[PDB]
Amino acid sequence: ALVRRKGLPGKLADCRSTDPRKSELYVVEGDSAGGSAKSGRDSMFQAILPLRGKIINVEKARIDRVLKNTEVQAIITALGTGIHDEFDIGKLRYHKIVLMADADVDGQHISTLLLTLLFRFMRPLIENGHVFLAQPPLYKLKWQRSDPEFAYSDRERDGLLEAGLKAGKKINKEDGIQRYKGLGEMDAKELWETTMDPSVRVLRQVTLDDAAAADELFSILMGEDVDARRSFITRNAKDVRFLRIEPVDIEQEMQRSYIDYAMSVIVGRALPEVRDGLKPVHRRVLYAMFDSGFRPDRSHAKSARSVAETMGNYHPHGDASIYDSLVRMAQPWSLRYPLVDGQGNFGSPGNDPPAAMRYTEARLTPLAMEMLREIDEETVDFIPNYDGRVQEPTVLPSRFPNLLANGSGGIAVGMATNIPPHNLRELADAVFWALENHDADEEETLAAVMGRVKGPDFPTAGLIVGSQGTADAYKTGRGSIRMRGVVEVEEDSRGRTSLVITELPYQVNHDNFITSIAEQVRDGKLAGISNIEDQSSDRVGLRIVIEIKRDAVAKVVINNLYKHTQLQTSFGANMLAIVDGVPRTLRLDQLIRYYVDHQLDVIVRRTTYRLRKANERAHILRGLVKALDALDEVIALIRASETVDIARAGLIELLDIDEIQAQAILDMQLRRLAALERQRIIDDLAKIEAEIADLEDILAKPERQRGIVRDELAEIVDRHGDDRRTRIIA
Amino acid sequence: ALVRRKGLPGKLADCRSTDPRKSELYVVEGDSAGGSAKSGRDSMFQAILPLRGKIINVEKARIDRVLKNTEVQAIITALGTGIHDEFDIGKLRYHKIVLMADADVDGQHISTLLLTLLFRFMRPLIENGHVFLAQPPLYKLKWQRSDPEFAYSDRERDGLLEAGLKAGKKINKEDGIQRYKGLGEMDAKELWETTMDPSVRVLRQVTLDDAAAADELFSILMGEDVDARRSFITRNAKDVRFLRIEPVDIEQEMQRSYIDYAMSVIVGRALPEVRDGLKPVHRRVLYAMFDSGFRPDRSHAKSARSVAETMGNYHPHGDASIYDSLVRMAQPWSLRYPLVDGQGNFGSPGNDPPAAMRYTEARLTPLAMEMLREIDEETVDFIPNYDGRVQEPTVLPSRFPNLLANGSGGIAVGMATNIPPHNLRELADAVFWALENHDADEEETLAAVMGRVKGPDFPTAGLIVGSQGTADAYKTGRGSIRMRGVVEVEEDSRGRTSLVITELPYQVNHDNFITSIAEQVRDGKLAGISNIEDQSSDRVGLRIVIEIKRDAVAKVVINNLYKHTQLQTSFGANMLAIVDGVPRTLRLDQLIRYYVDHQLDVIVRRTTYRLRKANERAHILRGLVKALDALDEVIALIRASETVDIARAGLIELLDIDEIQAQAILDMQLRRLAALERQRIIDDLAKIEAEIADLEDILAKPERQRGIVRDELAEIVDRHGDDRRTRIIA
DNA sequence: AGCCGTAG
DNA sequence: GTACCTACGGCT
DNA sequence: AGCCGTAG
DNA sequence: GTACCTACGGCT
Ligand SMILES: *[C][O@@](*)(*)C1(*)(*)(*)=[C@@](*)(*)[C@@](*)(*)=C2(*)(*)(*)N(*)(*)=[C@@](*)(*)[C@@](*)(*)=C(*)(*)(*)(C(*)(*)([O])[C@](*)(*)C3(*)(*)(*)[C@](*)(*)[C](*)C(*)(*)([N@](*)(*)[C@@](*)(*)C4(*)(*)(*)=[C@@](*)(*)C(*)(*)(*)(F*)=C(*)(*)(Br*)C(*)(*)(F*)=[C@@]4(*)*)[C](*)[C@@]3(*)*)C2(*)(*)(*)=[N@@]1(*)*
């Protein structure tokens, strides 16, 4: 018998029962889900404690930081047991602690973080079987005239769909299945009937078989040893798809949930695809904008519309992250070749953030259209979106080599990518060589491409010092590239010397840079500086003026700035990309080859598509010419026919043509019987037959395929290619 | 010479100049605009202080609230002069204080609030001519291949457009001209070139002619006397559109800006239109959803998409307010007849808020479709949206009497509306009478309608005590309607008496209600209560159980609850609506009549539209029959014709038909020459001619018009009408 | 501990 | 992932 | 000093 | 209108 809420957490919706043995606590992902849960629960014995998203990983955090965490405090207070040596099982307020997170890999992650907290801070709760996982449904199958059905697995969804269709139930396979990605999507009634009703619900009870084994696993998964974690996930993620209260071992739960999360982050969030150089968020935003018709030929659209359309139809995630991605693809200091044309305040290279998406407007850039060129000609694979309503492309055609041109930065689980941007003309040269020397071996190709791709070309210009770092990156996929800002020495009328900083290394925050100098001068770490002034403007660009003391040597001050500030920084190149669904550290030659392979695939697919469409068209045109030759009998037959169907059958017989051709004749407008229009049909047939011949020739001759790739890339480079900004010095 | 920051406001971007005479401070609406301004300014002399939206009205505000206001503190600190008796002009940091707010009525409002602050707290700044208003452009004309042009007036926009077109410049008919609603829409360069460059900018200098007159005006506009303000706006809003440094008198500026804001809020934000009962936000959301195809026949769409589409194409305001409006129209406890069908967490009648719009899904209700019925048949007026890209309806057809059915609540400037919801069947009865007794005078109509509309019918059910309040509201437009919750007396197994509260008055927050009782028991204001328990569930609804002491009398406790809690509350009826663009307090008879008038208008317009379309169709069909009669000559002519154009001209001559008919013949598919298809054209002509006759008869006979209105409303009531929830007791 | 870039 | 601040009016 | 609903 | 909290990794 323990007191209930009428100094416990404010956000906690407690139960009426004082008996811990009858009382249940649902720890719920966010306040949205918390609301549904609170409204749907039996308040007699079900308590609801909503959290603020990703709770602190207590494995990595100092105990002081963990105890200061508001979410951790709330959990400890709610449970009432205390922690570690002060842990008292007798004071437990709820004998069933139910973790209820969203039916997504992030939810799984939050579960893993919570289980880590309970294991490290309150182990006896797991030992004594007080910790449960709720199993909310993944899918709601909406039938016409029949009650909706709930599926808790992809397999179950497919099974129930097939069973319902066999039973004569009508769904709508497009919008028929709703995929719950967040508990906030379920109403209180649905949540109760599926997840919270003791009569219906399924709870997975967390068990602890081997404390020592569990201890080791938690260290690997949640600890600071990145290498151990990376190795754990590589060896096990291979075969994890094979590994009412249902018992589940904590070790197995942690392994499954964490590996699911890790692989999701790696293969489908944080890292670029080698062929188009796009993270999934980027691809979805650009395709959504394309499908919405936000093309360079039309007027800028409110950023909000693009974000909303993307979010609603694809990327089933937060609006902030989608908007941020969109903003970054619009920033000319972030991307060497922006993919979004922004109108309004898209932020500063300093600490000024972008305006709200309600104020900003955006559309695709001409270059972005080259990423999406002929996407409607089966040039790439399409898959069903998260819920299966619409189709989305797996990769973009990417007629421009975006991965190397724009680079990619990303933090995955147990790994990161950091690919620098490059000059389009240099990359094109490399591609042209690879096309011409298709049969060159790896060594020859590497040598050739390294000779043409001189190094990173950052949007912020500046200097690259030395070639070693670049060479290492190109040969191994890893390298330290030294970047330097540009300093000009100016002497004033009275005889004083000033350093003018005009260019900063890539990803250096202008404001933080200035503040850092000021701090260093204050601290006495930078000497010989009398005055520092920001004279930067829209009209003149970056102009930071550092006045040197009369006794100070300019060169000495410059060297100290290189040593003690981001005026000189190193770009840690890690050329990691997804290749055939696998993360790979790649050499420069490999990256070029994978791009070339993709472009060849695109041309073959485009040509195959066009050939099929040409044949379909030619088929119709042949039918029309037959009709035109027997025009009088055709018209007479149609007029004599009682029904369209009789006419159709009569035409098939009269002209020895198929259903498709007969229909096309029936669909011919009277305007087409004009002399010129008749001639046009004849001419169109001749032209299409010529096209068919050409398309067949392209398919037959790989040299023509390579030629097409070369010519079309050359066109893009002619129109969109630009001068190198970054200067390379010895 | 004053110090510049390298204890001043964090968000302030100060200037380099220490000379107040050369230094300028731009006080900017929000951080978005602040960013653009900061990036575009000349940092030598131009300081930027961004604010957090609507700064506190110091005229109304308690000194405690004023002193706590972070924005007010920031301004005082920035200027450095102090306030009132401690005001020191010599310490002024910037001799030019430039107010830069968004080119919208809200921006005008913020200006008025800032001018109120300066007048009350720092008057000498206005006296000495230190206060200026920035004048940004209204329009950006986007040319292809040519630099954009900026217009500061509608006349200037039109002039520049015509000049550019004469000069051979190409614009874009589909969003060539952008209407700036927010400074965040302008990039740094645009803002500088238009608004901040001393060489180009226009500043309006605020002057103070008569301190006493100004003092009185500020009291009227910004003070607590609502009646004085209401009277000021009614008399003056009539003729306010008639009343490089340009001087502007503070009195004139305040009057113009405040009246503009007030009228915008009154006529186009806070109050319903009498004909459809919709505030503009409601109309725009429902129409946006309609135009997007989010109909009851299709699958729920993510709330975000609806909000974004609404925001982007119409309602040029914050996403939070749009979403909140959408959520409220989905809440069955908020609306007697919900217009939005929500899926997911749309909040609770208590303190649980709705889930984020990224989780919730929404579509129109069947009843909402009755609001929008035949909107595509010129049944209502359309006007250009805020920027003129798209057309939007002024009012909805509203085939259901939404204003009275759903009610309306809103706070305008110097006024408010509070119309209670009513029973659809009762309202329909009233409408039917008004239709039948079209010529009845006001007195007769009032008597008749009051007899049929028994009183408010709240979504929360409960009780209405007495008829007086209802009668007053119906006769005057103002009334106090007493609402009461429902209490059941239950006796438990041990012999104790409990009060079970099952229904609460309209707009009573369930959680606050419970908390209020607990507080009153604690305070000793409620005696005889032993225990209070919330036994409410999704399955059983509202069930608050109050256990009474053995010595306590149930009836006494109930009466005390009615006295000291919202168990009994009064609905303050204020039946205020926009009639022909004017806010009007209306009687019940007037409200019914205005609705009936609207429905008659709709039927006449629909019939007129259908007649026109019928005639157009008949015209084509007549042409086709002529062609069918001379089929051989028609086909022969077309075949003999070199071009379609020659054929068209030949047909006009051969058949004595017009261009439209000739084209229709040319567009006829060969399938239509089948016997049945030919007959169908003949039959279609006969049918359409019958339709034309009927439509003409409807236009001729107002009795048929009233009949149509009656019948169609009756159909809606049959399908969507429901039982009275609210019980009326003596 | 604090910087980046998609996530809660 | 979450939580306050304000203008407006009319009751408490 | 605080409730409500479209606005910053 | 605005401002923090966190996971993830790899440099500082
Ligand atoms: C901003 O600031 C801030 C501060 C603090 C806080 N806290 C809590 C919460 C919050 C929030 O609210 C913020 C914001 C709001 C809004 C959101 N969203 C927006 C949007 C969305 C979507 F979906 C769309 Br389509 C749009 F358009 C918009 C964000 C966040 C805060 N805050």
Residue numbers in the entry:
A (entry chain A), B (entry chain B): 425 to 430, 437 to 673, 1014 to 1500
Q: What does the literature reporting this entry say, word for word?
A:
DNA gyrase, a bacterial type II topoisomerase, is a clinically validated antibacterial target. Unlike most bacterial species that have both DNA gyrase and topoisomerase IV (topoIV), M. tuberculosis has only the DNA gyrase enzyme, but with a simultaneous functional role of topoIV. It performs the essential function of introducing negative supercoils into the DNA as well as decatenation activity. Structurally, DNA gyrase is a heterotetrametric enzyme with two GyrA and two GyrB subunits (A2B2).
